[PDB]
Design a protein around this ligand. Structure first.
Ligand code: GDP
Ligand code: MG
Ligand code: ZN
Ligand code: ZN
Length: 854
RNA sequence: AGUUGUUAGUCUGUGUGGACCGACAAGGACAGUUCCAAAUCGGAAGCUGCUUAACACAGUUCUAACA
């Protein structure tokens, strides 16, 4: 009696809930709720048809099977495997076959990336098929039954049918029941004939002993079968473990043209960088050929080594241990990194139409002329960069940066590279996507700062100067900016997000952002042109990648797709967004039609006049920051001006490509910088405007102390910083104010907060002091607030207003539940516990600041 | 394998429709006197001293078990 059948019988002797829980013990699962909803609604993009997509992705990622050439899918069913395989590099045609009909699944015609090369046929049983020549053969046929002999016979039938297909080609066949002696003998004969191994997918439910026979990979069948069987047996009596969760597979959209995907790099521009990278790592450099990069270039790879809850906060915010999102925030590996790269960065946006490029050029020229009506560009200096680094104004490894700045050979390296830039070549300007390496990277950043740092150090995109940007405001002013927008006559307030803004920057966008050089001086212009044309339009990137033989860093390159970690990313993103929404408003007002977009030479007098007359006005109906936009057009035709927006390649997120945009009317609901804004009324009758966000996110981000040092002296100070931020910006949430008072009461008063709380450009970090928080609140919201005419100070933490209970609950509070009530009443005990744990330092009771404990 | 459904009760929304209103407050929540609401009284309507409906349609209301 083999082990497998023993497992089968033991399983067959289970009960209802015992079965329901044992089938999900220690397996990984895919959150299909979003996909289920989307498919139910009727979307045609960005969605896996079933869970077959992730199941095959697990194989494809680890190079167990490498789909290539023509892919034949047998038993495609809904089409998960076929649609996933349509979006790989070497694949060129996918044919899926299935029985279909009553009691069977049918293909779901969709338009994910690569749909134009996929043909799915129904009403064809594969068993009576005249097998053809296939370069990849995927088979996912099988029907599980309690009877083991029936499954055995079914398995033999499947293997017999599938054998005449395998003619030295990549394959992945599903074997439902591999623990039977004749099944095993047949598998061994097949392996001897064709090679390949037998492996278990970890996404497969626990109820089944299914495995997959795959081409790339060798091993012993019986040993692996026994290994899986023993795993099932030990999971039988193993304590229930909740199933690990994995994010669903994204699949892009649009037709795929394989003949236009590969990129031809300007080797004479990046050759020096590539050569230096090769020389530094010459022991392991090797042109791997299994590279999955479709739209980027590939140049090589080298081996490399592959590379916590805050105690105090978690000890004081217990009731949220059960909220799902709070934990889910806490949960960068090369597998996840590669998935992110494959489904987000590795696309190719179609070229704009002939008229659209002309429109974009005209708009960019006018916009750069208008932005520079007062200020003039200037070179930054070494001392400015030094000061900015020293003040520590997206990581924590700043001390090494400061040491590099204060060193001297570093500046010699920078000078050498700068002379190279003046010549017209770039040697060591290459950036990652995760100490000589440190100095080269920091020097590249410094040169970019020197050339394009005036876009921040002179506030080129402040609200006063740019008419749209919100640089230099901070959170406590975006609300008033939105309110002042809403008073302007017009339609709704559309905040249409864009999917992966960085990765949708056409070449023309860079060519237009380059126009700022037309206003500098030649000594500056040489350096700026060097930056633009040698490290923005020809970028060389390193990226990790896992392979059966460890982790290798790939070196790739591309010409579009502004890298997210460059100086001047914010400024140029804001500029592109401003001109994009300007064009969208242009179309919305009828000046720009389809015919105008299509003709190669649209007359520019019309656009010139429209801009010169109304551009400044239409620029005041917006609030822009990076990819975040809010726009209030004159009439609601704006919601249907999607030709210009989609043609430029800026496709909106989570909405079909042509469904008109949905705009709000209550400005207190329009999202902006991941916040919305509430208008409070104090007892004095003078109104405040405050930020707000689903407080699960706030608590989560408070419980994810990230490299702040394990030192209790440091985690406590980080918690204090978070609490003071809560008291200063989110004082109007009952849970947040209560928890903030608790934390600030359970940390010694003399300790100084460190380890900055947020990375957003919209935080001036007023909470990072040691002062009477009431005074800082007064300074932030009363004295230094341009929108508060009556400067009468607030004297105690009781005149400070609160959100209405309805809105407070609606934004994710926990008032009205029993656990929160008990926590609120017992908060003194938890404070005492933290005080005892800390030591014997001074503690001020901030709880009496509420009328609860007074 | 992928897919994954019924049954009964309960919370929304709407309509039909006489189909509700006010005062009040036990108690709870909240910590900004800020909100819930039993029980009671008063009125309103219906069928004669008693009642505050019932049904319909839809849910990612919740519950509870069955394929
Ligand atoms: O993961 P999946 O293959 O979808 O599980 P299935 O529900 O399809 O069942 C497969 C396999 O599991 C056994 N089984 C199903 N339902 C069961 C039950 O209620 N109680 C027991 N003890 N076993 C059960 C069945 O053998 C079937 O072949
Ligand atoms: Mg099943
Ligand atoms: Zn360089
Ligand atoms: Zn809110």
């Amino acid at each position: 009696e083999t082990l497998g059948e023993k497992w089968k019988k033991r399983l067959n002797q289970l009960s209802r809930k015992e079965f329901d829980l044992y089938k999900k013990s220690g397996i990984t699962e895919v959150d299909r709720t979003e996909a289920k909803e989307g498919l139910k609604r009727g979307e045609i993009t960005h969605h896996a048809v079933s869970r077959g997509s992730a199941k095959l992705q697990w194989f494809v990622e680890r190079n167990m099977v490498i789909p290539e050439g023509r892919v034949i899918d047998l038993g495609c069913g809904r089409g998960g495997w076929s649609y996933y395989c349509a979006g790989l590099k070497k694949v060129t045609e996918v044919r899926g076959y299935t029985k279909g009909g009553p009691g069977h699944e049918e293909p779901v015609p969709m338009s994910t990336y690569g749909w134009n090369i996929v043909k799915l046929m129904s009403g064809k049983d594969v068993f009576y098929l005249p097998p053809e020549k296939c370069d990849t053969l995927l088979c996912d046929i099988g029907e599980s039954s309690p009877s083991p002999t029936v499954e055995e016979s079914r398995t033999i039938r499947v293997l017999k049918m599938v054998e005449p297909w395998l003619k030295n080609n990549q394959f992945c066949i599903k074997v439902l029941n591999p623990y039977m002696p004749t099944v095993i003998e047949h598998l061994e004969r097949l392996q001897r004939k064709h090679g390949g191994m037998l492996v278990r997918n970890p996404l497969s439910r626990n109820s089944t002993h299914e495995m997959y026979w795959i081409s790339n990979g060798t091993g012993n069948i019986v040993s692996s079968v026994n290994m899986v069987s023993r795993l099932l047996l030990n999971r039988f009596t193993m304590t229930y473990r909740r199933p690990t969760i994995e994010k669903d597979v994204d699949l892009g959209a649009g037709t795929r043209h394989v003949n236009a995907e590969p990129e031809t790099p300007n080797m004479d521009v990046i050759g020096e960088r590539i050569r230096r990278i090769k020389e530094e790592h010459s022991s392991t450099w090797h042109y791997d050929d299994e590279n999955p990069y479709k739209t980027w270039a590939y140049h090589g790879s080298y081996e490399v080594k592959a590379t916590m809850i805050n105690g105090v906060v978690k000890l004081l915010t217990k009731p949220w241990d059960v909220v799902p999102t709070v934990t889910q925030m806490a949960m960068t590996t090369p597998f996840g990194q590669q998935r992110v790269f494959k489904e987000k960065v590795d696309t190719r946006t179609p070229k704009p139409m002939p008229g659209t490029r002309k429109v974009m050029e005209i708009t960019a020229g006018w916009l750069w002329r208008t932005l520079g009506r007062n200020k003039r560009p200037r070179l930054c200096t070494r001392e400015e960069f030094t000061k900015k680094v020293r003040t520590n104004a997206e990581e924590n490894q700043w001390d090494s940066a400061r040491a590099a700045v204060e060193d001297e050979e570093f500046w010699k390296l920078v000078d050498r590279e700068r002379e190279l830039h003046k010549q017209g070549k770039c040697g060591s300007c290459v950036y990652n996507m995760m100490r000589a390496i440190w100095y080269m990277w920091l020097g590249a950043r410094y040169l970019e700062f020197e050339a394009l740092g005036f876009l921040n150090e002179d506030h080129w995109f402040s609200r006063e100067n740019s008419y749209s940007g919100v640089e230099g405001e901070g959170l406590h002013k975006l609300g008033y900016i939105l309110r002042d927008i809403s008073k302007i006559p017009g339609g709704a307030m559309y905040a249409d997000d864009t999917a992966g803004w960085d990765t949708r920057i056409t070449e023309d966008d860079l060519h237009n952002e380059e126009k700022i050089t037309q206003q500098m001086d030649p000594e500056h212009r040489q350096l700026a042109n060097a930056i633009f044309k040698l490290t923005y339009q020809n970028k060389v990137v390193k990226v990790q990648r896992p392979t059966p033989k460890g982790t290798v860093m790939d070196i790739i390159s591309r010409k579009d797709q502004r890298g997210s970690g460059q100086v001047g990313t914010y400024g140029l993103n804001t500029f592109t967004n401003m001109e994009a929404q300007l064009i969208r408003q242009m179309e919305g007002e009828g000046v720009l039609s389809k015919t105008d977009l299509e003709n190669p030479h649209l007359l520019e007098k019309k656009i010139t006049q429209w801009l010169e007359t109304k551009g400044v006005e239409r620029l005041k109906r917006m609030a822009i920051s990076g990819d975040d936009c809010v726009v209030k057009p004159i009439d609601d035709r704006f919601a249907n001006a999607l030709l210009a927006l989609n043609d430029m390649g800026k496709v909106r997120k989570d909405i079909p490509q042509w469904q008109p945009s949905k705009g709000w009317h209550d400005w207190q609901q329009v999202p902006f910088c991941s916040h919305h804004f509430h208008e409070l009324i104090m007892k004095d009758g003078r109104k405040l405007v405050v930020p707000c966000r689903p407080q699960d996110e706030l608590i989560g981000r408070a419980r994810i102390s990230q490299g702040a040092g394990w030192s209790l002296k440091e985690t406590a100070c980080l918690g204090k910083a978070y609490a003071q931020m809560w008291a200063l910006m989110y004082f109007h949430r009952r849970d947040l104010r209560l928890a903030s008072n608790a934390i600030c009461s359970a940390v010694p008063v003399h300790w100084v907060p460190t380890s900055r709380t947020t990375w957003s450009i919209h935080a001036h970090h007023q909470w990072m002091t040691t002062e009477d928080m009431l005074t800082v609140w007064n300074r932030v919201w009363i004295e230094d607030n341009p929108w508060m005419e009556d400067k009468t100070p607030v004297t105690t933490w009781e005149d400070v207003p609160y959100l209405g209970k309805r809105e407070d609950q609606w934004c994710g509070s926990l008032i009205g539940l029993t656990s929160r009530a008990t926590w609120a009443q017992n908060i003194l005990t938890a404070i005492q516990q933290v005080r005892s744990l800390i030591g014997n330092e001074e503690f001020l009771d901030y709880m009496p600041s509420m009328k609860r404990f007074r």
